[PDB]
RNA sequence: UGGCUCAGCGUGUGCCUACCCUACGCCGGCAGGCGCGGGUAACCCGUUGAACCCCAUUCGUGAUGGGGAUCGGGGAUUGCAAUUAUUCCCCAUGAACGAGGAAUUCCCAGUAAGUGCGGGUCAUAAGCUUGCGUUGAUUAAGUCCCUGCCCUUUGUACACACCGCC
């Protein structure tokens, strides 16, 4: 396809707060933002209607802007409901894909509300212990001394 | 020998270095032209298919795990 | 006539050494289409002497533990390596494989517990040792590398058959000969 | 220097009814010896006979035919 | 001559039949064909825009050479090995919805129907145009 | 069988079937010449390979291999 | 009618089962019956394997028990008023019999 | 503390009190929805009756009387908020304030069954060679 | 006693349901082919049940 | 990621005792749900369309599309009850690990090793075990050196028998 190079090749992209490596292919390039994995990246570029075989550097800035505005607003552009990251939220009930440092914020506030009501999961998150019912006698010592 | 870390979508210097150096030596595989010029290796596959489309090289094996090319014979 | 893999007619190769032409099986009666059979070659001693050489190479290539029954993979690995070799040098791939086996098998070795004396090597142990060294060299050259296993095997065989002190196999052979000479 | 009688007395103190089977006592004493010692020439059999002399030949211990008991 | 489906290579037979089946735009393709994930033992919905046509092709071929198959037979046919984390692998069946949809879409083309027992089988129309595609691809390969 | 086993069964069946057809319906010397030209190339073209498979025994993962043994 | 009936013979003992099948078949054939011979269904082997020790101590030895079931089918082409008495004289306590019509 | 909105799934506590079982099934998550869709048995209803009685017998502007229970698998319903429940550990009855923001949980995850461990010294054979 | 809480925990499915038909123990129970014997009692009675050690 | 193409053991509705194996059609993206049959079985699941392997694609030596721990949210199923997560599914999160020190296990032919599939346990369920096929080798046909065993002669202050006695 591309004979030699695009003349205006953006080597490093800067999308929300993270550096997207422009030498990777586009789906596996934008998977470097939190909240977006391989699966979600592939569906949002299928919805954006860009050719997946081109790398991240030779996308034009309008195409990047389209990819972002359909990444942040997935439900308006027929991303299926069961596909999302934060669906039926415990604070406002609406359905979303947290895709940024906001995902870190959402994880933080979930942890601190469980800690604030002093439920068992919040207590085990407050200590350094395992949460999902594993045995702690033999494994898990790497973080510990 | 720390990291290779260099190349994709080569410049004009690597392009014409390819066009004058690759199609006349015997073993032409994506691996030997990847380690030969600086090419990444998927770019090498694409470039070798494009050269075969022009017709400067000859296809020999064409397996999914190993594709082998060679220079055109001289007579 | 049989012309293994549909090319590379077999009855032109020459095994120079007497000691190893007794134990190398590329000649006209051990001339077969493919390096694959259910041989039952391990039932007695020296029945691997009459197994053809290409099938011994494919057998030793099916090894590091994640490859233990995968023989069809090694058959096409050997096929691709042979095409690469004939394309690189123009010589019969069987002949250069035979020369590699000749040049990589050590001829003197040392053994004891209390490596004390240097002994001589039977001309079946050096065939086995040469095949093992060649396959090990190809395996270690291709491990974390962009080069595929087929042209790694090809360059191992051509460097061993010329003799360069650049194959893994002939480096190991020379080192074994040197250590054996040290306490002869 | 590893202290044999003191370690055996300490193990017998942290036991139900000051009572322990010979096998468990031997296991704990040998693990302690390997984790504190500085001398290395002593063999496994010499350590075993040293332990047998330590338990069967002490007035503070008694052998109830498969076990060791702390007497008062 | 000759020829039939059996005596041609099945890989480019499926490629040619999917090309024919895409070219005549009557195959009904559902709306979620780009978010499917295709049989939950695998990830990364296929590296193809037109996987539905090839799946319909291979379903038509399988119903040609072994009739009476249902959705359970197809979800057994397109099953595979599920790599399962740090636990060892196992066999998982295919997606039932995509098998039902390719079967219903092929019924919409009047080249398969529900037979007298359970399952489906080719019409005379279906085996007719599959043998025509087989003739086309066989003539292409030999010449 | 498998893929390879089916390949070997196919070719053995074809060779043995040609030998039987020649022996029942054309002259015996023709059967002898096709038979011996098959015997000097890969005898399994006419004689079946009898080695089947060995049973697993209850101390390890397979027929011969045994589970890893621990000492201390 | 002329009735087609089928006799099913199952046992854990092979030789006695074949004795019963043979004597019933020859008693039918001497009585001008068209009989389809004994069709041997594939034998069933029930394979309880257990740990051989009452406690959990020792070298992990296992017992391998098995029990084998053998089946035969015999077909007759005359009314039941002779076959009931010809099978009542062939008992051999290890064999368990169902007689059934082809209509069943 | 700036805002006073509870908003469990986008709905705050008042219309979340007067709403029936069959739509707060849709409001909950899967496990609680299955528990409610399936039968909620007699002793659960007895606990709710005791909680309502202790709530309405409480004098205004202080907390109601503590109600003990072994039922540490009860779903915390919106009906239960602001109550005083003693949840069994196996050993003791633990005082739990049913806050508004714990209405999707079990009573068992507010009364811990074990004492969290702080380690002593490894005893004798605790470290081998 | 009394009647409505004596045996009231449901002995449906699980190890509290099933027991050996010889010794009424609950552990090591063989329920294949409807034996419902514990493994020790099965080893005791296997020869005259009809199971033979044969290979 | 797609396409193609091959197994063998064997289980299946129960005294108390409810709990079976499932084809086919429809709904759901999936886990699953709803109808309808068959099977007390060489009869139905089932021609058991298994996985590895095979062919084509993408990746390109980067802790990387290797690896999948840990953790957030949501959906189901079993159950009288799932929180200290039963199991399963989906989207996110993406840790050590770059072939392993001193030591040390198992193994010689359809064997080792790879790879799946049954049974037991089982309401729910296999990283375990017990079986089965499938792909399929390197090395060896020796020795008593190490660890031991058997036999003969020999020494002995041991006989709780060298972990002895002193
Ligand atoms: Mg095995
Ligand atoms: Mg990664
Ligand atoms: Zn019993």
PDB file of C-alpha atoms in Angstrom, chain I residues 2 6-7 10 19 27 32 41-44 46-47 49 53:
ATOM      1  CA  UNK I   2     -40.511 -30.653  68.424  1.00  0.00           C
ATOM      2  CA  UNK I   6     -36.307 -31.757  64.602  1.00  0.00           C
ATOM      3  CA  UNK I   7     -35.057 -33.043  61.229  1.00  0.00           C
ATOM      4  CA  UNK I  10     -33.105 -30.589  54.156  1.00  0.00           C
ATOM      5  CA  UNK I  19     -24.552 -43.284  53.417  1.00  0.00           C
ATOM      6  CA  UNK I  27     -17.059 -41.183  53.472  1.00  0.00           C
ATOM      7  CA  UNK I  32     -21.445 -45.900  40.616  1.00  0.00           C
ATOM      8  CA  UNK I  41     -17.205 -52.524  52.430  1.00  0.00           C
ATOM      9  CA  UNK I  42     -16.980 -52.838  48.656  1.00  0.00           C
ATOM     10  CA  UNK I  43     -13.549 -54.416  48.927  1.00  0.00           C
ATOM     11  CA  UNK I  44     -15.000 -56.805  51.490  1.00  0.00           C
ATOM     12  CA  UNK I  46     -16.734 -57.434  45.843  1.00  0.00           C
ATOM     13  CA  UNK I  47     -15.942 -61.110  45.282  1.00  0.00           C
ATOM     14  CA  UNK I  49     -21.099 -59.388  44.419  1.00  0.00           C
ATOM     15  CA  UNK I  53      -9.742 -58.804  40.131  1.00  0.00           C
TER      16      UNK I  53
END
